[PDB]
Design a protein around this ligand. Structure first.
Ligand SMILES: O=C1N(c2cncc3ccc(F)cc23)CC[C@]12COc1ccc(Cl)cc12
Ligand SMILES: O=C1N(c2cncc3ccc(F)cc23)CC[C@]12COc1ccc(Cl)cc12
Ligand SMILES: [Cl-]
Lengths: 297, 302
């Protein structure tokens, strides 16, 4: 029993974190095989700024060992520093681009040293509600499937509302953001509906049923309600994905939608669900199944 | 900016997790140097659990009855001893991945990271607090026994908790790494229950200071309170008493934000009376009590 915001074990990623210094800027790098990946803002016309740099300008430190940079190239908003030594701790890995609503673990780092790990979600507005200070750039987001680390995020900046923006590991930004000091803002955010439903199923599995009702709804009627409360539309794919949780608890997906509609129109009336007075949207259907079954890595 | 429930990076602990099997029971062990630490109830059957005589059950076992697996390698048990509710299995190989470590016993209100494990394999990491009633609100299934709680301030791992059992309300009970239980619990299947729980007042105040540091002041008021008037009100909402130690501990956060501890206590009193009126504090509609004054200073900007 119990339901916590749980991150993946971070050890496979900890063994990849390095410190990257160029001039007065120090940030984090990800060392995989013989390449260190980091935000290109560590060095704007980035091609013009990069051509003026030599390999020895990039100081890379892995623990108490200085790695030697033997090459450098830019891919979108990520800088790839070729080093002479392959990381002996390189895990089995892939670079994957995630979709809004998907969750991942963040290993927050400062000076190439990991300080904490937390779980978060890519918001529908492409920002992440992270916890980062100056020096955290280059910190990464990931998931683990069996023994393979799927790197999905690299931290680049903080927006004026305190939320965060970054790229995939191929340097493509999530969201309409750019890596430069200019007027940028997070767009209006929405709630991840499929994730709220997954969390309601987790609450039922853990013994909370007060919000259940005898009613059902249609996808069309539910989506009219979701639009009114700034909730993302629910698709037939989302309904299909919630199939296993619907079969386990005996509550059809549109039956849980009628519970959610009632919660949106009436509130919680002083009650809580899994220790929360707000509807939680940062657990996917897969996260719920994984935590309620104890999958290991 | 931002404020998350943050766990310590788990790698140093992942390299210590092993699987311990005795008869039909399999659970997790912590391998440090040449010793594997695990709950002593690994020697029990489900029947034995009502009134187990651990000394009598242990004397009947030999070293080869304990199967210890570290990854795909079987370790050899060369000795065994019991210390309180923990079993210490001496092995013939020291863990080459043993980090710098200490065993620390924590007090209620302290936080720690839990590396939840099944069959000696880590499945996830989350942040917990030792509740005032000595239980933890964890997330554990059958097979999670032997999973550990820890803190990693600097490069040293301080092991503070080892998971032993789930109580009927879904909360969890365990020991320090010397095998002493937190609270009045026993590693027996007798009728046991968590006592009435209370809110960790010093942690709620720390979290209100975190909200002020992050730019939120809506909840502040023009009032102050004596410590005794604060405690008389707070006890009516099942909040733990605030002591002069707690007031002293909140000194640095008070100096940084310019809000006196007793002035923040007055704001807490008003929040308990009024509720949040549709507002949130650091993305939460409830008053959060699982961040210590030390956690706030560590995570927040100076
Ligand atoms: O947002 C930024 N940074 C921060 C990142 N994460 C949390 C931060 C928290 C506070 C802070 F002051 C800065 C933070 C540091 C660099 C910087 C400042 O200006 C930039 C412009 C463009 C780009 Cl790509 C990056 C940045
Ligand atoms: O609570 C217990 N266990 C569980 C632990 N953590 C989450 C569990 C979740 C579910 C579950 F069914 C068991 C869990 C497994 C062993 C067991 C069953 O009875 C006991 C009595 C005394 C002691 Cl010391 C231990 C136990
Ligand atoms: Cl303590």
């Amino acid at each position: 029993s119990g339901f916590r915001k749980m991150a993946f074990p971070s050890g496979k990623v900890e063994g990849c974190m390095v410190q990257v210094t160029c001039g007065t800027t120090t940030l984090n790098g990800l060392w995989l095989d013989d390449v260190v990946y980091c935000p290109r803002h560590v060095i704007p016309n980035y091609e013009d700024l990069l051509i003026r740099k030599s390999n020895h300008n990039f100081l890379v430190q892995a623990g108490n060992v200085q790695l030697r940079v033997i090459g450098h190239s830019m891919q979108n908003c990520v800088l790839k520093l070729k080093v002479d030594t392959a990381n002996p701790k390189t895990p089995k890995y892939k670079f994957v681009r995630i979709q809004p609503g998907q969750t991942f673990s963040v290993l927050a780092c400062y000076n190439g040293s990991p300080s904490g790990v937390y779980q978060c979600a890519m918001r529908p507005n492409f920002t992440i509600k992270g916890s980062f200070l100056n020096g955290s750039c280059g910190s990464v987001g990931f998931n683990i499937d069996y023994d393979c680390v799927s790197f999905c995020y690299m931290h680049h900046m903080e927006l004026p509302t305190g939320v965060h923006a970054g790229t995939d590991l191929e340097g493509n930004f999530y969201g309409p953001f750019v890596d430069r000091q200019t007027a940028q803002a997070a767009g209006t955010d929405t709630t991840i509906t499929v994730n709220v439903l997954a969390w309601l199923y987790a609450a039922v599995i853990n013994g909370d049923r007060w919000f259940l009702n005898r009613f059902t709804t249609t996808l069309n009627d539910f989506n009219l309600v979701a639009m009114k409360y700034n909730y993302e539309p629910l698709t037939q794919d989302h309904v299909d994905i919630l199939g296993p949780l619907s079969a386990q608890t005996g509550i059809a997906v549109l039956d849980m939608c009628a519970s959610l509609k009632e919660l949106l129109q009436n509130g919680m009336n002083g009650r809580t669900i899994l220790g929360s007075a707000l509807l939680e949207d940062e657990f996917t259907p897969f996260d719920v199944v994984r935590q309620c079954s104890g999958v290991t890595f």
